[PDB]
Design a protein around this ligand. Structure first.
Ligand SMILES: C[C@H](NC(=O)CCc1nc2ccccc2c(=O)[nH]1)c1ccccc1
Length: 357
């Protein structure tokens, strides 16, 4: 017989969030923005095997880019294999050869996003328990439940609301700052325990992490992650910024009606003893011995004299509130704005999610 659909328990803002982060249109938009052939790679067809085969093909390119010339297959031939595994669309012209470190990392990053899209699809698979029960949750409750992540919408007068708003406003773009729509407190439990393990580290800061909308569901289910092919200017870690405007550059939003909707995280990061750098080092896989984080220091930093603190689970967590000011020691840094790196997933726990227009 027909199953009852129970009424949705979620507030309107949370329903919109849930709709957005599981939206098939959103996921396909994201694949189009990454030059993927959505006709050849429908969401239902995405598989862990294909994604692994994709990374294998990129691993062969990487070896060709580094270690020869030694009689291996040409970059063209190796590129062609990759494009067979992971179909791309360049207006049905031939896709281009993956013949630089930059392009190799860009393709690795594309596959990391695609892997989180596939995660979201796999998460939504209907269980046998669900086929047998005679009543089902509203689809949005079901999707929310799949995250195994508590989201609590804040209002204006929550203790931390003004602190968060100030952090956004003071360190966001001066001319056209993202407009704050909603903040949710994020409690992904089973993040709590591994995070407790760094309770000794006094130097905690609440930092920005901007992402593709297509990876928000994955992050809510599993936290911020370091994957085998993660990389960037400061190597294989989790990247954060103290300046919203830096992180905002990584937000991939979506046009909805007359607005552009984007999501940004704030994580509590146990930075411990910081190692400061002033030139790019893509080879890093941990801080130097004796250090707990690497901070690629920018020409500017939110003015430290305006820092405040929030008390999160009884630990003081620094929250910048100042506009960015120059840091003379780092005026010649290769970095305009700071990038904060950790190399263990346990050193971050998600605290807030912001919707910005
Ligand atoms: C490729 C994508 N990476 C990101 O979402 C990180 C984006 C990001 N990079 C930064 C770099 C320097 C400073 C700040 C940031 C940031 O806020 N986000 C990814 C990484 C792993 C799994 C799924 C997706």
């Amino acid at each position: 017989s027909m199953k009852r659909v129970q009424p949705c328990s979620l507030d309107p803002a949370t329903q919109k969030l849930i709709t957005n982060i599981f939206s098939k249109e959103m996921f396909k938009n994201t694949m189009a923005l990454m030059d993927l052939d959505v006709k050849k790679m429908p969401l239902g067809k995405l598989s862990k095997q294909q994604i692994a085969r994709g990374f294998e093909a990129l691993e062969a390119l990487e070896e060709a880019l580094k270690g020869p010339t030694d009689g291996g297959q040409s970059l063209e031939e190796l590129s062609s294999h990759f494009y067979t595994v992971i179909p791309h669309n360049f207006g049905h012209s031939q896709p281009p050869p993956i013949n630089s470190p930059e392009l190799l990392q860009a393709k690795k990053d594309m596959l990391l996003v695609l892997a989180d899209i596939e995660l979201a699809q796999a998460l939504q698979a209907v269980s046998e328990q669900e086929k047998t029960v005679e009543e089902v949750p509203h689809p949005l409750d079901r999707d929310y439940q799949l995250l195994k992540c508590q989201l609590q919408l804040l209002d204006s007068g929550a203790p931390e609301y003004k602190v968060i708003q100030t952090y956004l406003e003071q360190t966001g773009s001066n001319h056209r700052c993202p407009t704050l729509q909603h903040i949710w407190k994020v409690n992904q439990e089973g993040e709590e325990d591994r995070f407790q393990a760094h309770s000794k580290l006094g130097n905690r800061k609440l930092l920005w992490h901007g992402t593709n909308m297509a990876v928000v569901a994955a992050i809510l289910t599993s936290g911020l992650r370091i994957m085998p092919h993660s990389g960037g200017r400061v190597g294989k870690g989790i990247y954060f910024a103290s300046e919203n405007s830096k992180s905002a550059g990584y937000v991939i939003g979506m046009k909805c009606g007359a607005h552009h909707v984007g999501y940004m995280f704030l994580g509590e990061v146990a930075l411990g003893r910081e190692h400061h750098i002033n030139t790019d080092n893509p080879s890093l896989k941990s801080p130097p011995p004796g250090f707990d984080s690497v901070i690629a220091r920018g020409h500017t930093e939110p003015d430290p004299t305006q820092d405040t603190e929030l008390e999160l689970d009884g630990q003081q967590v620094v929250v910048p509130q100042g506009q960015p000011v120059p840091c003379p020691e780092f005026s010649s840094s290769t970095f305009s704005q700071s990038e904060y790196l950790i190399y263990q997933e346990s050193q971050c726990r998600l605290r807030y999610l912001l919707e910005v227009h």
